[PDB]
């Protein structure tokens, strides 16, 4: 029944900077939200549990933050590798539900 | 090393039912569950179920309650995700998946994904 | 002065040691089939089951331990089939074996008990001393002395023990008469040893 | 009649084969001694000497309990105990709680040591006891796997509100205060509350503290703050069955909840222990009494005796015929057909007592009765024609009344006379034989004479496998609260959950209570 929603669809940034990713649930999820991100190849890879745990295997390049109903996904310095599309489970209610998902871009113009 | 090979693409007219299947190498599937992942182009991804298959016992969402039924064979390594009454609605691309931890639940391997498409052709 | 006065004390007081000592070990030996699950100390095993049970038993044993090797004598021909105090030795150990037995061995209740006491009783009896004057004060004793304490459990008024209830349907009398045949034993041994 | 006539060839033929028994002084005692091994030794490497198995180690990647009566006979090979054949009682899990606190500073108190740990007990408890399954195919929550207890012995009404009853048996430092987390506040006296129970002196059944703490006393102890230690303290699950998955997302659980940095606790094995049935020493004293009793038959029937030219040896020589008979005899049970299992330590005496002497030493007199002074083969002969018939009607009474002992229904006398039968006949072999040999030789013998750092955490592997520095009657004290027996079952431990916590030193100053430096507790002779 809980909906997460990622409002910005769209997130251009520049290779080497801080990227910044955030979901809201539609209720308290009790910091039970994992990211997910699927490269444009269709593989898909896990990179932060519970909240902030990071897999094995995952740079530190990735870090993941928030409580409640606010979450938020972060990216020190914007890699090639790094351009997909990233999405956010909740594992607090049975039927999990993903996010909407974001897609990543480099700047034009 | 843990790999979740899935069968190729299909494509089906509306009205069949097709049968995806999963091999998993690297571990046996009676140690963890086994779970089906709908993702259509917009959509976004949504849950189907999953399997026990050291016990049998499955459990879908509410939605996939009728339409998707899920089994696994422990001497095979594989588990089944079959579809009944294929409409239009159907064309996504289906992931089979597992999860090690059993309370963050979180699905750490992931198969490469089969297109499944539906038309009268 | 005589002889007799200063002897008939030595082996009752002797006697009446050997049976409440016998009567204490048997106590244990009779009453550890079950074990509390904490299990207690080695001081409590002094009068652990019946408060007066130990000085009656010493004193009926010294009584019939200095009466047996007196009617033999009143009668004649005293006792000389088992001189030695090795066959005495051996009466106690068969005796505390008998009681053992009894403590941790389980037979048909009814039809076998009549024959295993008895022809082990009988065994024990022409074994040990085959006096027939002797069987018949065993057979007079261990009864009649039996049927007077079962009557008085039974009434209901000194009901210490539930599973004995009526008499003549359990194995003691058979344990009684072998602690009558090894006591009497043991003081006409020492009898003839002083 | 027949009488007279079998009894002069008895004597014949004991006449005749007593010079042959004379004949042959050392042929005679090595073919006694080749046989006595050959019979029965062997064999007797078999029987278990005693020594076993109490502790089972099993891996926690697939378990099932042991079947009970799969087989009708145990695999020989199999390493599988004896005892490791039922269903367990119960799974303990434990969860050891450790913890740290920031820069210690010098207003910290003695009862801060107590109060910040404990003070998460109430919250860690409620944790694990609504902890569920959101995606579970068998159980769900923590009361389908409990063990549920209804009410501890009587005569324990000093114990209520300090135990769990009615329900789940969890064991934790919040029993104290019975899992009020504002009785624990408003308690004024934390340690005198903790150590209101403790004995004042030593006790073999486990302390009350103790079984709530699950822990040693010196990982508990109050001399802690003098080391700026912190007290660790263990809450305990008792689970009547075994379910992998619920204990594993427990485990999850508890280590999102409090993650525990540079823990590598391995998790991999179970550990299997076997409580044996104490014997106390009630039932040991029949057990010395009836020894004691042999002893002084055995040196009574010998001293009746005088010998040649020894003094003891003829006496020591029979008590090593019926020993070696004996030893014989329960041996060669296992060739009979019959089943050995009887205990023995308790038989012995009465078979030795029954088996008797009287054989041995009657065939003596006459011997040394004898009136030839100088031949050996002689003194022999008329001494065992002296003997002859004696020691048979001996034996034949002593062996008749044991077919009537066996003939009963009772299957502990029929084994006990069954091992009678053989004992006394290979007894009435061995002295036929070895005790008239080394007579003679006596006899042949005597004629020819004449800065301040707290420390940290660690999770080394001293504090897995915890449970086995508590005290050795710490689960049977447990158990027998709740009429619950040990005495011939096991136990499965499972692998312990590290919870590990940081402490804050403003919550202590924060929370300080007046007169907090004050107890009536005070640590006794230490
Ligand atoms: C404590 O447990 C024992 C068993 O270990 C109980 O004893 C049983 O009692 C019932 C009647 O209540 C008898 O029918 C059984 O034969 C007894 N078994 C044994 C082995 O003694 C005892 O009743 C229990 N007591 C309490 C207070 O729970
Ligand atoms: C000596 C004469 C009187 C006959 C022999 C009787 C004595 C020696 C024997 C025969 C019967 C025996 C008793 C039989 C049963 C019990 C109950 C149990 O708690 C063990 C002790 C006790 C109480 C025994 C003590 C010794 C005993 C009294
Ligand atoms: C020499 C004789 C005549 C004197 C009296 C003998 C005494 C010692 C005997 C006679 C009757 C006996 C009792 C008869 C019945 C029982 C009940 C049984 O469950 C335990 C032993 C007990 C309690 C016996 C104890 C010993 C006893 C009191
Ligand atoms: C006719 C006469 C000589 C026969 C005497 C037989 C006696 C000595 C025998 C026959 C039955 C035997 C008992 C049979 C069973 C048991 C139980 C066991 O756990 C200890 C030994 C014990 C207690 C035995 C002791 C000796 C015993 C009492």
Redesign the interface.
């Known amino acids: 029944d809980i909906q997460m929603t990622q409002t910005t669809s769209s997130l251009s940034a520049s290779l080497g900077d801080r990227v910044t990713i955030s979901c809201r649930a539609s209720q308290d999820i009790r910091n039970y939200l994992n990211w997910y991100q699927q490269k444009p190849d269709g593989t898909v890879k896990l990179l932060i549990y519970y909240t902030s745990r990071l897999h094995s295997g995952v740079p530190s390049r990735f870090s993941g933050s928030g409580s409640g109903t606010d979450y938020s996904l972060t990216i020190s310095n914007l890699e090639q590798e790094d351009i997909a599309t990233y999405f956010c489970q909740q594992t607090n209610t049975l039927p999990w539900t993903f996010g909407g998902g974001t897609k990543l871009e480099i700047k034009r113009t | 090393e843990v790999q979740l090979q899935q069968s190729g693409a299909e494509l089906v007219r509306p009205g069949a039912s097709v049968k995806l299947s999963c091999t998993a190498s690297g571990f046996k599937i009676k140690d963890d569950y086994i779970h089906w992942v709908k993702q259509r182009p917009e959509q976004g991804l949504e849950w189907i179920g999953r399997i026990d298959p050291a016990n049998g016992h499955t459990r879908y969402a509410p939605k996939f309650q009728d339409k998707a039924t899920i089994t696994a064979d422990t001497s095979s390594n594989t588990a089944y995700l079959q579809l009944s009454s294929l409409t239009s609605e159907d064309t996504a691309v289906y992931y089979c998946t597992r999860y090690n931890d059993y309370d963050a639940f979180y699905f750490d391997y992931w198969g490469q994904g089969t297109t499944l498409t539906v038309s009268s052709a | 002065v005589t002889s007799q006065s200063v002897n008939v004390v030595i082996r009752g007081v002797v006697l009446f040691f050997i049976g409440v000592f016998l009567a204490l070990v048997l106590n244990l030996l009779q009453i550890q089939r079950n074990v509390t699950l904490f299990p207690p100390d080695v001081v409590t095993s002094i009068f652990s089951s019946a408060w007066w049970v130990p000085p009656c038993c010493g004193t009926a044993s010294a009584v019939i331990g200095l009466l047996y090797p007196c009617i033999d004598r009143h009668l004649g021909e005293p006792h000389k089939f088992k001189r030695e105090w090795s066959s005495v030795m051996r009466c106690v150990a068969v005796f505390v074996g008998i009681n053992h037995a009894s403590a941790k061995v389980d037979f048909d209740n009814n039809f076998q008990f009549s024959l295993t006491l008895a022809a082990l009783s009988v065994g024990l009896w022409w074994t040990f001393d085959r006096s027939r004057s002797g069987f018949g004060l065993g057979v007079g004793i261990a009864f009649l002395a039996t049927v007077v304490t079962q009557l008085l459990v039974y009434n209901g008024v000194y009901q210490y023990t539930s599973p004995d209830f009526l008499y003549v349907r359990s194995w003691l009398p058979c344990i009684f008469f072998a602690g009558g045949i090894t006591m009497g034993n043991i003081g006409r041994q020492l009898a003839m040893y002083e | 009649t027949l009488t007279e006539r079998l009894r002069e060839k008895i004597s014949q033929a004991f006449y005749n084969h007593g010079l042959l028994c004379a004949s042959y002084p050392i042929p005679i005692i090595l073919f006694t001694g080749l046989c006595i091994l050959a019979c029965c030794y062997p064999l007797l490497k078999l029987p278990l000497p005693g020594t076993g198995p109490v502790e089972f180690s099993t891996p926690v990647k697939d378990y099932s309990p042991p079947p009970v009566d799969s087989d009708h006979k145990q695999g020989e090979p199999s390493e599988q105990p004896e005892w490791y054949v039922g269903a367990p009682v119960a799974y303990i899990q434990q969860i050891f709680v450790k913890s740290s606190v920031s820069p210690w500073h010098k207003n910290l108190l003695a009862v801060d040591v107590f109060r910040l740990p404990l003070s998460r007990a109430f919250q860690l408890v409620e944790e694990i006891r609504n902890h569920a399954?959101?995606?579970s195919?068998?159980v769900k929550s923590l009361e389908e796997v409990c063990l549920q207890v209804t009410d501890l012995l009587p005569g324990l009404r000093k114990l209520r509100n300090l135990l769990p009853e009615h329900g789940c048996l969890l064991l934790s430092p919040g029993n104290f205060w019975q899992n009020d987390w504002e009785r624990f506040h408003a308690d004024p006296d934390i340690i005198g509350t903790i150590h209101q129970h403790e004995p004042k002196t030593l006790q073999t059944?486990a302390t009350l503290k103790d079984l709530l703490f699950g822990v040693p006393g010196k990982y508990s102890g109050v001399s802690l703050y003098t080391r700026k230690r912190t007290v660790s303290y263990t809450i305990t699950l008792v689970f009547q069955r075994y379910d992998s998955?619920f204990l594993?997302?427990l485990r999850?659980?508890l280590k999102?909840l409090h993650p525990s940095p540079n823990c590598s606790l391995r998790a991999e094995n179970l550990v299997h222990v076997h409580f044996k049935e104490?014997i106390?020493?009630?039932?040991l004293?029949?057990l010395v009494?009836?020894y004691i009793?042999?002893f002084?038959?055995i040196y009574?029937?010998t001293r009746?005796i005088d010998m040649v030219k020894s003094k003891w040896g003829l006496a020591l020589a029979a008590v090593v015929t019926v020993l070696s008979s004996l030893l014989m005899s329960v041996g060669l049970c296992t060739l009979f057909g019959l089943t050995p299992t009887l205990n023995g330590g308790?038989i012995f005496?009465?078979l030795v007592?029954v088996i008797?002497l009287e054989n041995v030493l009657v065939l003596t007199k006459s011997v040394v009765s004898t009136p030839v002074d100088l031949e050996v083969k002689l003194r022999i002969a008329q001494g065992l024609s002296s003997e002859s018939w004696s020691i048979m009607k001996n034996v034949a009474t002593e062996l008749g009344?044991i077919l009537?002992?066996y003939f009963?229904?009772?299957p502990?006398?029929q084994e006990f006379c069954l091992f009678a039968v053989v004992g006394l006949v290979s007894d009435f072999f061995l002295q036929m034989f070895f005790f008239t040999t080394v007579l003679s030789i006596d006899i042949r013998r005597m004629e020819l004479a004449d800065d301040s750092r707290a420390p940290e955490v660690t999770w080394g592997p001293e504090d897995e496998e915890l449970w086995r520095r508590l005290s050795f009657r710490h689960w049977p004290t447990l158990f027998?609260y709740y009429n619950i027996?040990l005495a011939k079952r096991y136990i499965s431990l499972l692998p312990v959950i590290p919870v590990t916590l940081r402490l804050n030193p403003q919550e202590a100053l924060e929370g300080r209570q007046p007169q907090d430096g004050r107890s009536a507790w005070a640590p006794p002779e230490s």
């Open positions: 399954l959101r995606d195919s068998g059944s998955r594993s997302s999850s659980r999102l104490e106390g020493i009630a039932e004293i029949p009494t009836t009793i042999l002084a038959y009574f029937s009746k308790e005496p009465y007592v008797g009344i009537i002992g009963t229904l009772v502990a006398i027998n027996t």
